[PDB]
Every structure is written in structure tokens, then in C-alpha cells.
Design a protein around this ligand. Structure first.
Ligand code: FAD
Ligand code: FAD
Lengths: 390, 393
């Protein structure tokens, strides 16, 4: 099957890229190794930057996001037993913190793609990349895991297949440089059936560790506890999880944490990762296939959306005028934004998490930063602007 | 000899405290173990916070600071071969980065104190503190090192005697908690007979290490190079110093580093240190006797001035109304400001210095932070407000 751009992965990066290309008359074929049900059924976060909201609306796929999304005026930084509100709406001159679950974004983009004649193969298996260093790259795969071996002949391959996809290894080790940080802690995330304890997100730093109170709906809440990076979910009974959440979220004015059944519990590791370059011949990486951020800053899906806007612009210049300049500089342009988001995500992570390797001096300056950011208008404005994207 | 407040040390802390107390009719006696010539020859601080400039003017001792000090509208962060201006004057609503050397501040305060009947003993020896946990603390010392043993009977002792003075050990180890950070680098500081290369301070991050271009006068410049903490001045010839300064300060638009005789060179170590509490009975610490910051943020002299403003207010409430509240909370009030300045000094230090222990990712985030603080109005404003001093309590 011949196309212009072969896309590996139907996450936010692959789906947004395929639709941006469609809006400019450029054809694509997406392959996805999981089922449509699986990709549409995640409990992944939905904190969207203003740029991602603008992009969804610009693309004509933002109607359900605007109708069903939750628009908050701010969020809270809790530390030393006190909550401190960051009024994003006041500090940014009218913007909101937007939440619209990643699975909802995926559902909207899959539906828009299928409705506009888009080609998406779900449940593919045995995926491989070939001749990426030529003008005729190829993608090979088997439909429905064990179908006959099929080939996509294309001009470009977009590697939108996440951290463990096959596209990043297709950039030879001798050409790439990787940057990484392993945080000395992980998150224990829980999906709970209970009303929300507060109207806005709560990012809490406590002597015992970090806690994050988020939401999905009026009935379903999403909460996280910082845990030691080696910890297993079998070390954390429901009783221990709720006791630790109550301890870390405690306030002098008496906060009431609403508890319920934990439908899901799991440990997720926290990492920073940057691959440079994000291209090799006709292969171009975007999103988690090229870089990872710790989720404290909620930048991952937003960076995937920024990467594909640059890639689509380069592809458009190639098909319209035969120009290669923007494609040649795709890595250069994307990395400028990536490094700033990596810095912010690292800043939020280190400011809010307990580090047991920290000296008492380091813990003192961590608490001093928390005091400063919540008592300075410029520091709070900078946090607000970084949080909703810039 | 009886007095109200016995002060150990004639640095910025002790001198500012003695004069603030004089302005409120409170007597003091200062003892200083170095000569007046030695303390007036001090080479270190150059930059004053806006609050310290306001304090010197408020106290009636700011005339020479205004006439001879240098008032800059901003400073530069140089990285990736390009200079980025932080317009402090614009971002702070009218404040300046003030360059007026620590030794000039000391000269002005010693003169003002002596002119107003102040008692200062220079070149003292054999100094000791006694009965600090009583209502009658005492300071013992020998004038001119070989004098007869003298005693100062006072109501309070102010420990303004610097990092290695005798006052901090007088707070028992069982009552205090110390916080510290060790840095792998030091500063090689030089004094050069040359004109200024630029109108404003230059803080440069380079692959080879940090460099700072500061000034003293139109004819004397003060420059610093980051060096390994175990380096000695004999490892650094004048040729090696200039070659390293030219390399680290290089810009794509071609910066001209103005050279001349390097008449002073020395290596100075750096650290972060906080002692909590800063008081024990009638003994109260202030300045470097209580806390140290690495010099990248130009906070140390400024923090000593902030500490003594709080201490003077407490002492004033005690003598005027017999109230102990402000004195009881002196450590609490001072520490809130100290911790924020400790964070900022650590932030400036770690963003600008080369650390060979950094992973490639940590080097990337360091350069991203330099890009961020120079590309956001709110981030540059936050940087500027911290640089010229956060609001006083
Ligand atoms: C706890 C947590 C919370 C987060 N919260 C937020 C947040 O609020 N805001 C935010 O912006 N980001 C957030 N993120 C990050 C965000 O979810 C990711 O950065 C984002 O999913 C990356 O999108 P992507 O399209 O690059 O990759 P992915 O979402 O991983 O999509 C890649 C797709 O490729 C498919 N694929 C894999 N291998 C193959 C193959 N062989 N063949 C075909 N297809 C294949 C996968 O099945 C997958 O569907 C969070 C992450 C975590 C862990
Ligand atoms: C390279 C460098 C650059 C700096 N630049 C700046 C800057 O630009 N801005 C800034 O704000 N700060 C700066 N600082 C910090 C600043 O110099 C100090 O924080 C400041 O000197 C502290 O003043 P102090 O009065 O607390 O102590 P000190 O200045 O140390 O004075 C204490 C005094 O006590 C005396 N003393 C000691 N023992 C005894 C004893 N037994 N009896 C009697 N007297 C005794 C000493 O002789 C001394 O005169 C810098 C420091 C360095 C190293």
C-alpha cells in the first residue's frame, strides 16, 4: 500500500500528525499495535496546555473538548500544612487550567480521522522499519497480529510509537546522543470511586513525601503518592495508601480527604529522557518516542502536539514547494521547546518531591523555594505561565 | 566598663548595629581583634541591595555611598557566547544594582561611629564570652593584645564576629542545628589596574567554567574565575588568568576584555551555612557569625544588614517598653529572610558554575535555566527582585 507519510502509533502524536496532514491534502496511513478499545480506554491524565487547546480548535476537532472539558481558575501548592492557591486565571489575564482526559482526546481524533477517510490499522503485529536512509522508506507489519505480511511504501516515516516503540532504535546508536535522569522515587497511582475533596488540583509536598490529588469526573478521582523507586504494589495495602494520603495531605485548618474503593493501583517510574537527533534520513520521531518528562509538570502530550506541528510544517513545505529546510531543522526547532519543558518538569519534580538523599540544607532551600513561589507575584506568574504553556 | 550592648566585631553587622542603636539612644561598646587599617583594607563585597542603600541613607551615613558608589540599571547573564541584559531598574520599578565596596562601607561607618562618641577598641586580644545565659553577660578582652584584662558588663552581647569568631561556639552544640553545603569550586579573584570592559556586571557561564566581571572604580576592576577548590594561586600565572578570562568571556559579537597589571590575586573558598538558632540567652548572632552564602548572589553583607535591623528593633522595644517579644522572635524573623537568600545564592551558584559531576542531562537543564530566566518577563522580574533584595519583613 502506497502513501505519502507512514505513521507508527495512534497516540496523540500520530493522530494529531495524520489530521494536520489531512488538513493540507497530504495522505498518511497509521498502524497501531493495540486495539481501538485499548487506546480509547486509558485512564491517562488530561492536563492540556493552552497551545494544545488552540491546536484542537484550529484543527476543527475541539468541540467535545470545549463542551466536556473542565476549566479551572487555578491549582494549589500545599506545604508546611498549608494550602497556597496559584490563581492562574488572575495571573495570566484570563486563561484557565484545562483538563480533558487523554483517552477522550484519542477518541475524538480517531473519530475525526475515520470520518475524513483516514486509514488506521489497529491490533497490528510484527512491525519493522526498512530503508529509512533512502528516498523510499518502508514499514512492514501483520494486520490483526497474525495476518499476511504487508508493506507500506512511503516518502517519510513518522515514529509516533512511544518510549518503547520500534522507531527510535531505527536511528543508529552511532548517530544519536541520549540524555537521561532517573528520579530516586516513583508514583503509586490510584483510581478511586469517591466525590472530589477539592475543586482544583492539589500538589502537596510533605515531610513524608509528595501527594497529588487530581480528578476524572464528579464520581471518579485520580490520586498519586510518591514512593521509593523499588517499591512494589504488594508493599501497599489499601489501608496503607489511604493512611499515607491522609498524613501527607493534612493541613492545620483540617482538610477532609474523601476516600473510596481503589478500583486500580499501580506504580509508575519517573524519568527524564531526550534523544538528539529526532530524525535520520526519512524517519522523523515525535512525542514519547523522542523524549520523556516526569509527569509532575503534565508536559508529555503537550510536547507531542508541539513536535508534530513542526513536523507537519516541514512535510507541507516539501510537498508544496520541494523545500527541505524545515525538515532538515525539525530536530533543532523541536529541541528548543523540549529542553524548556524538560527544565520545567524537572523544576516541578524537584520542588515538590521528598528526596531522601537530600541534606538538611537542601530540604531547607526546597521549603524556601515553595515559600518564595507562593509569596511573589512574579514567581507565581512565571509558574502559572509555564504550567499552562508558553 | 559598663554598657547596654557589647558588640564583638567591627564588620558591617557590628558597625551598622552600633550606629542603629546610637540613633535610638542605646549605648554600645565594640571590640575588634584586627586593626582599623586592616578592616578598612578588606577586599571582598562589591554589591549592595536596594534595602542596604536605603538603610545607609536613612541612618545619615550614605553621603559618600551616593557620591562615589556606582548605580547600574542592570546586569548581564552571558552564556552560549551571547550577552543577555537583566534590566533591574525597569523590572523593579526604579531600583539599581549598587556597587560600593565593603571596605568603603566600613570606612564610612567607623568614621560616623567615632564622630558620634562611639566606643571602638581595635587590635584587641584574648577575647572571651561569659554568663551569656544570665541577665548580666560579660565580654573579656585585652586592649592592643598586651593590655590588662578588661571586662565589658552589658545586658546583651551581639556576636557580629564573622564565621570564625568566638560568639557562635558560645551557643551550646546541644541547642543548635547546623545546615551546610560544600562546593567543588572556589573563586580566583583579581584586582586589575584597567578601565571597565563594560558598563554593567557580567556573570558568564562557559563550557570551561564561570567568570564574573565586576568593578571598583574607573581605574580598578574586580574579576573572578571559577577554579577547582584545591587550586592555589601559584598554579595561576597572569598569562593563564587572562587566557582563561578571554576564553570564558568570549562572545560571537567579539567582546573586548580590557587588560592591565593584575596587582592582587587570591583564591577564596565558598560555602552555604545556616545556624539555628541565632540566639542563646542574652547572646544574639548576626551576619557571617550565623550564616554564610556562596558569593554569586552578593547577599552576605546585605543579610548582615538585614539581621541587625531586626536585632536593633528588638533591643529598642526592650529598652523603651520592657518588651521581649521581638527579641524572642529575632531568630525566627531573621531565618525567613536568610533561607530565601540561601536558596537564591545556591540557585545563582548552581546555574552559573561548571560542575564536572553533572550528567549531560544536568548540563542541558543548566543551559535551559539560563535561557528561561532571560526570555520570560516574569522570570527576569523574579531574578531581578531576588538580586536587589526581597522586601523586608
Ligand atoms: C502518570 C502520567 C500522567 C501524565 N499526565 C499528563 C498530563 O496531564 N498532560 C500531558 O501533557 N501529558 C501527560 N503525561 C504524558 C503523556 O501521556 C505522554 O507524553 C503521551 O501519551 C505521549 O504521546 P505519544 O503519542 O508520543 O505516545 P503514546 O501515547 O505512547 O502513543 C504511542 C502509540 O504507539 C503505539 N505503538 C507502540 N508500539 C507500536 C508498534 N510496534 N506498532 C504500532 N504502534 C505501536 C502504542 O500502542 C501507542 O498507542 C502523563 C504521563 C504519565 C505516565
Ligand atoms: C569573594 C566574596 C565576595 C562577596 N561579595 C559580596 C557582595 O557583593 N555583596 C554582599 O552582600 N556580600 C558579599 N560577600 C559577603 C560579605 O563579605 C560578608 O557576608 C560580610 O563580610 C559579613 O559581614 P559581618 O559583619 O557579618 O562579618 P565580617 O565582615 O567577617 O566581620 C566580622 C568582624 O569580627 C572581627 N572579629 C573576629 N573575631 C574577633 C574577636 N575574637 N574579637 C573581636 N573581633 C573579632 C573580624 O576581624 C571582623 O572584622 C562576599 C564575600 C566573598 C568571600
Amino acid at each position: 500500500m502506497r502513501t505519502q507519510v507512514g505513521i507508527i502509533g495512534a497516540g496523540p502524536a500520530g493522530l494529531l500528525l495524520s489530521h494536520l496532514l489531512y488538513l493540507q491534502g497530504i495522505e498518511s496511513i497509521i498502524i497501531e499495535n493495540r486495539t481501538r478499545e485499548e487506546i480509547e480506554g486509558t485512564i491517562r491524565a488530561g492536563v492540556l496546555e493552552q497551545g494544545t487547546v488552540d491546536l484542537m480548535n484550529q484543527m476543527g476537532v475541539g468541540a467535545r473538548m470545549m463542551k466536556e472539558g473542565h476549566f479551572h481558575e487555578g491549582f494549589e501548592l500545599r506545604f508546611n500544612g498549608r494550602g497556597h492557591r496559584i490563581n492562574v486565571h488572575e495571573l495570566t489575564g484570563g486563561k484557565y487550567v484545562t483538563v480533558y482526559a487523554q483517552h477522550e482526546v484519542i477518541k475524538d481524533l480517531v473519530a475525526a480521522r475515520l470520518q475524513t477517510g483516514g486509514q488506521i490499522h489497529f491490533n497490528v503485529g510484527d512491525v519493522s522499519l526498512h530503508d529509512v536512509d533512502t528516498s523510499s522508506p518502508k514499514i512492514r507489519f501483520r494486520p490483526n497480529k497474525d495476518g499476511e505480511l504487508q508493506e507500506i511504501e512511503c516518502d517519510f516515516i513518522a515514529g509516533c510509537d512511544g518510549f518503547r516503540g520500534p522507531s527510535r532504535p531505527a536511528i543508529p546508536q552511532s548517530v544519536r546522543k541520549e540524555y537521561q535522569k532517573v528520579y530516586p522515587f516513583s508514583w503509586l497511582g490510584i483510581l478511586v470511586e469517591a466525590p472530589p475533596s477539592a475543586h482544583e488540583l492539589i500538589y502537596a509536598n510533605h515531610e513524608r513525601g509528595f501527594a497529588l490529588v487530581s480528578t476524572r469526573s464528579p464520581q471518579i478521582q485520580r490520586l498519586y503518592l510518591q514512593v521509593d523507586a523499588q517499591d512494589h504494589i504488594d508493599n501497599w495495602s489499601d489501608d496503607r495508601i489511604w493512611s499515607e494520603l491522609h498524613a501527607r495531605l493534612e493541613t492545620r485548618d483540617g482538610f477532609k480527604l474523601l476516600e473510596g474503593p481503589i478500583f486500580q493501583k499501580g506504580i509508575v517510574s519517573m524519568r527524564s529522557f531526550v534523544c538528539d537527533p529526532m530524525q535520520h534520513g526519512r524517519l522523523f520521531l515525535a512525542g514519547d518516542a523522542a523524549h520523556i518528562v516526569p509527569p509532575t509538570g503534565a508536559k508529555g502530550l503537550n510536547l507531542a502536539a508541539a513536535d508534530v506541528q513542526v513536523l507537519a510544517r516541514g512535510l507541507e513545505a516539501y510537498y508544496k514547494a520541494g523545500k527541505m529546510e524545515i525538515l532538515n531543522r525539525c530536530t533543532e526547532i523541536c529541541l528548543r521547546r523540549i529542553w524548556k519543558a524538560e527544565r520545567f518538569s524537572w523544576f516541578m519534580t524537584t520542588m515538590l518531591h521528598r528526596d531522601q538523599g537530600h541534606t538538611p540544607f537542601e530540604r531547607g532551600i526546597q521549603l524556601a523555594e515553595l515559600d518564595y513561589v507562593t509569596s511573589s507575584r512574579a514567581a507565581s506568574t512565571s509558574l502559572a505561565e509555564n504550567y499552562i504553556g508558553l
